Coordinates of all heavy atoms in Angstrom, one line a residue:
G1 N 0.8 -1.2 0.0 CA 0.0 0.0 0.0 C 0.8 1.3 0.0 O 0.5 2.2 -0.7
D2 N 1.9 1.3 0.7 CA 2.7 2.5 0.8 C 3.3 2.9 -0.5 O 3.5 4.1 -0.8 CB 3.9 2.3 1.8 CG 3.4 2.3 3.3 OD1 2.2 2.6 3.6 OD2 4.2 2.0 4.2
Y3 N 3.5 2.0 -1.5 CA 4.0 2.3 -2.8 C 3.0 3.1 -3.6 O 3.3 3.7 -4.6 CB 4.3 1.0 -3.6 CG 5.5 0.2 -3.1 CD1 6.0 0.2 -1.8 CD2 6.2 -0.6 -4.1 CE1 7.0 -0.6 -1.5 CE2 7.2 -1.4 -3.7 CZ 7.6 -1.4 -2.4 OH 8.7 -2.2 -2.0
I4 N 1.7 3.1 -3.2 CA 0.6 3.7 -3.9 C 0.3 5.1 -3.4 O -0.5 5.8 -4.0 CB -0.6 2.7 -3.9 CG1 -0.2 1.4 -4.5 CG2 -1.9 3.3 -4.5 CD1 -1.1 0.2 -4.1
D5 N 1.1 5.6 -2.4 CA 0.9 6.9 -1.9 C 1.9 7.9 -2.5 O 3.1 7.8 -2.4 CB 1.2 6.9 -0.4 CG 1.1 8.2 0.3 OD1 0.7 9.2 -0.3 OD2 1.7 8.3 1.5
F6 N 1.3 8.8 -3.3 CA 2.1 9.9 -3.9 C 2.0 11.2 -3.3 O 2.4 12.2 -3.8 CB 1.9 9.9 -5.4 CG 2.7 8.8 -6.1 CD1 2.3 7.5 -6.0 CD2 4.0 9.1 -6.7 CE1 3.2 6.5 -6.4 CE2 4.8 8.1 -7.1 CZ 4.4 6.8 -7.0
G7 N 1.5 11.3 -2.1 CA 1.6 12.4 -1.2 C 0.6 13.5 -1.6 O -0.2 13.4 -2.5
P8 N 0.7 14.6 -0.8 CA -0.2 15.7 -1.0 C -0.3 16.2 -2.4 O 0.7 16.4 -3.1 CB 0.3 16.8 0.0 CG 0.9 16.0 1.1 CD 1.6 14.8 0.3
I9 N -1.5 16.6 -2.8 CA -1.7 17.1 -4.2 C -1.0 18.4 -4.4 O -0.7 18.7 -5.6 CB -3.2 17.1 -4.5 CG1 -4.0 18.0 -3.6 CG2 -3.8 15.7 -4.6 CD1 -5.4 18.3 -4.1
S10 N -0.9 19.2 -3.4 CA -0.2 20.5 -3.3 C 0.4 20.5 -2.0 O -0.1 19.9 -1.0 CB -1.1 21.7 -3.6 OG -1.7 21.6 -4.9
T11 N 1.4 21.3 -1.8 CA 2.1 21.4 -0.6 C 1.2 21.7 0.6 O 0.4 22.7 0.6 CB 3.2 22.5 -0.7 OG1 4.0 22.2 -1.9 CG2 3.9 22.5 0.6
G12 N 1.2 20.9 1.6 CA 0.4 21.1 2.8 C -1.1 20.6 2.8 O -1.7 20.7 3.7
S13 N -1.5 20.1 1.6 CA -2.9 19.6 1.5 C -3.0 18.3 2.3 O -2.1 17.5 2.3 CB -3.1 19.3 0.0 OG -4.4 18.8 -0.1
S14 N -4.2 18.0 2.7 CA -4.6 16.7 3.3 C -5.2 15.8 2.3 O -5.7 14.7 2.7 CB -5.5 16.8 4.5 OG -6.7 17.2 4.1
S15 N -5.3 16.2 1.0 CA -5.7 15.3 0.0 C -4.4 14.8 -0.7 O -3.5 15.6 -1.1 CB -6.5 16.0 -1.0 OG -7.8 16.3 -0.5
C16 N -4.3 13.4 -0.8 CA -3.1 12.8 -1.4 C -3.4 12.2 -2.7 O -4.6 11.8 -3.0 CB -2.6 11.7 -0.4 SG -1.5 12.4 0.9
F17 N -2.4 12.1 -3.6 CA -2.6 11.6 -5.0 C -2.3 10.1 -5.0 O -1.3 9.6 -4.5 CB -1.7 12.3 -5.9 CG -2.2 12.1 -7.4 CD1 -3.4 12.7 -7.8 CD2 -1.5 11.3 -8.3 CE1 -3.8 12.5 -9.1 CE2 -1.9 11.2 -9.6 CZ -3.1 11.8 -10.0
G18 N -3.2 9.4 -5.7 CA -3.1 7.9 -5.8 C -2.1 7.5 -6.8 O -1.9 8.0 -7.9
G19 N -1.5 6.3 -6.5 CA -0.5 5.7 -7.4 C -1.1 4.7 -8.4 O -0.3 4.3 -9.3
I20 N -2.3 4.4 -8.3 CA -3.1 3.6 -9.2 C -4.1 4.5 -9.8 O -4.9 5.1 -9.1 CB -3.7 2.4 -8.6 CG1 -2.6 1.4 -8.0 CG2 -4.6 1.6 -9.5 CD1 -3.1 0.2 -7.3
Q21 N -4.1 4.6 -11.2 CA -5.0 5.5 -11.9 C -5.6 4.8 -13.1 O -5.1 3.8 -13.5 CB -4.2 6.8 -12.3 CG -3.7 7.6 -11.2 CD -4.7 8.3 -10.3 OE1 -5.9 8.4 -10.7 NE2 -4.4 8.8 -9.1
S22 N -6.7 5.4 -13.6 CA -7.4 4.8 -14.8 C -6.6 5.0 -16.0 O -6.1 6.1 -16.3 CB -8.7 5.4 -14.9 OG -9.4 4.9 -16.0
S23 N -6.5 4.0 -16.9 CA -5.9 4.1 -18.2 C -7.0 4.6 -19.2 O -6.6 4.6 -20.4 CB -5.4 2.8 -18.6 OG -6.4 1.9 -18.7
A24 N -8.2 4.8 -18.8 CA -9.3 5.3 -19.8 C -8.9 6.6 -20.4 O -8.6 7.5 -19.7 CB -10.6 5.4 -19.1
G25 N -8.8 6.5 -21.8 CA -8.4 7.7 -22.6 C -7.0 7.7 -22.9 O -6.6 8.6 -23.6
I26 N -6.2 6.7 -22.4 CA -4.7 6.7 -22.7 C -4.6 5.6 -23.8 O -3.6 5.8 -24.6 CB -3.9 6.4 -21.4 CG1 -4.1 7.5 -20.3 CG2 -2.4 6.3 -21.7 CD1 -3.4 7.1 -19.0
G27 N -5.5 4.7 -23.9 CA -5.6 3.7 -25.0 C -4.7 2.5 -24.7 O -4.7 1.6 -25.5
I28 N -3.9 2.5 -23.6 CA -3.1 1.3 -23.2 C -3.0 1.3 -21.6 O -3.0 2.3 -21.0 CB -1.8 1.3 -23.9 CG1 -1.2 -0.1 -23.9 CG2 -0.9 2.4 -23.4 CD1 -0.2 -0.3 -25.1
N29 N -2.9 0.1 -21.1 CA -2.6 0.0 -19.7 C -1.1 0.0 -19.5 O -0.3 -0.5 -20.4 CB -3.2 -1.4 -19.1 CG -4.7 -1.4 -19.3 OD1 -5.4 -0.6 -18.8 ND2 -5.1 -2.5 -19.9
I30 N -0.7 0.6 -18.4 CA 0.8 0.9 -18.2 C 1.2 0.4 -16.8 O 0.8 0.9 -15.8 CB 1.2 2.3 -18.4 CG1 0.7 2.9 -19.7 CG2 2.7 2.5 -18.2 CD1 0.8 4.4 -19.8
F31 N 2.1 -0.6 -16.8 CA 2.7 -1.1 -15.6 C 3.9 -0.2 -15.4 O 5.1 -0.6 -15.9 CB 3.0 -2.6 -15.7 CG 1.8 -3.4 -15.7 CD1 1.1 -3.7 -16.8 CD2 1.3 -4.0 -14.5 CE1 0.0 -4.5 -16.8 CE2 0.1 -4.7 -14.5 CZ -0.5 -5.0 -15.7
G32 N 3.8 1.0 -14.8 CA 4.8 1.9 -14.6 C 5.6 1.6 -13.3 O 5.5 0.5 -12.7
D33 N 6.3 2.5 -12.8 CA 7.3 2.3 -11.7 C 6.6 1.8 -10.4 O 7.2 0.9 -9.7 CB 8.0 3.6 -11.3 CG 8.9 4.1 -12.4 OD1 9.3 3.3 -13.3 OD2 9.2 5.3 -12.5
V34 N 5.4 2.2 -10.1 CA 4.6 1.7 -9.0 C 4.6 0.2 -9.0 O 4.7 -0.4 -7.9 CB 3.2 2.4 -8.9 CG1 2.3 1.6 -8.0 CG2 3.3 3.8 -8.4
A35 N 4.3 -0.4 -10.1 CA 4.3 -1.9 -10.2 C 5.6 -2.4 -10.4 O 6.0 -3.4 -9.7 CB 3.4 -2.3 -11.4

């Protein structure tokens, strides 16, 4: 789970960005660095 935490969306925010995201509209699935 800790690999999927990309931290605050902006400095000091309590909303954090996820490391698993939809590939919808990218046209391919991507096993990037998180995986």
